[PDB]
Design a protein around this ligand. Structure first.
Ligand SMILES: O=NC(=O)CNS(=O)(=O)c1ccc(F)cc1
Ligand SMILES: [Ca+2]
Ligand SMILES: [Ca+2]
Ligand SMILES: [Ca+2]
Ligand SMILES: [Zn+2]
Ligand SMILES: [Zn+2]
Length: 158
């Protein structure tokens, strides 16, 4: 399907969850982008004003697209594949409790998966893949993409 046709990609954080320290949100998102730039030719840059390729949004319930959120649990986040406008954007359900650790829902881990979608990946049937569509906490300090994730992304880029 669709991929970004350029190497320099921008992101912007639209708003911040009150669940976390601001700096921790910035760092979780930055690290999640780094996971993918590690294994592709892409470069990601945070911008503070204007139109970014990938807008990161925290919202609850109905929030202006065809993917209303469902309160605590269930759908944690969703993202749109590469394209103009809302293409690339990643939305996180504010009815979750976002964290830097094993409590609540880990923002970094969720964001790695969502950014996969923002870059054009679909879901994997392999439970070991970050793109497996079921949330399960794993240690973030030593996180690695599965072989399936790497072959998926390198089928699109590089
Ligand atoms: O992209 N959104 C989805 O696939 C919807 N499922 S999810 O929110 O439980 C979810 C989100 C992110 C994960 F890493 C795992 C599960
Ligand atoms: Ca939810
Ligand atoms: Ca966009
Ligand atoms: Ca919340
Ligand atoms: Zn949405
Ligand atoms: Zn998904």
């Amino acid at each position: 399907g669709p991929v970004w046709r350029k190497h320099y990609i921008t992101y912007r954080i639209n708003n911040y969850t009150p669940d976390m320290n601001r700096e921790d949100v910035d760092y979780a998102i930055r690290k999640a982008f780094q996971v993918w730039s590690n294994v592709t030719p892409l470069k990601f840059s945070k911008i503070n004003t204007g139109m970014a390729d990938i807008l990161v949004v925290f919202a609850r319930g109905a929030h202006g697209d065809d993917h209303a959120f469902d309160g605590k649990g269930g759908i944690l986040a969703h993202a749109f594949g590469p394209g103009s406008g809302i293409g690339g954007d990643a939305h996180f359900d504010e009815d979750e409790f976002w964290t830097t650790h094993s409590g609540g829902t880990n923002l970094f881990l969720t964001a790695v998966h969502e950014i996969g979608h923002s870059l054009g990946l679909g879901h994997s049937s392999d439970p070991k893949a970050v793109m497996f569509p079921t949330y399960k906490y794993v240690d973030i300090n030593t996180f690695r993409l599965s072989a399936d994730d790497i072959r998926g992304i390198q089928s699109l880029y590089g």
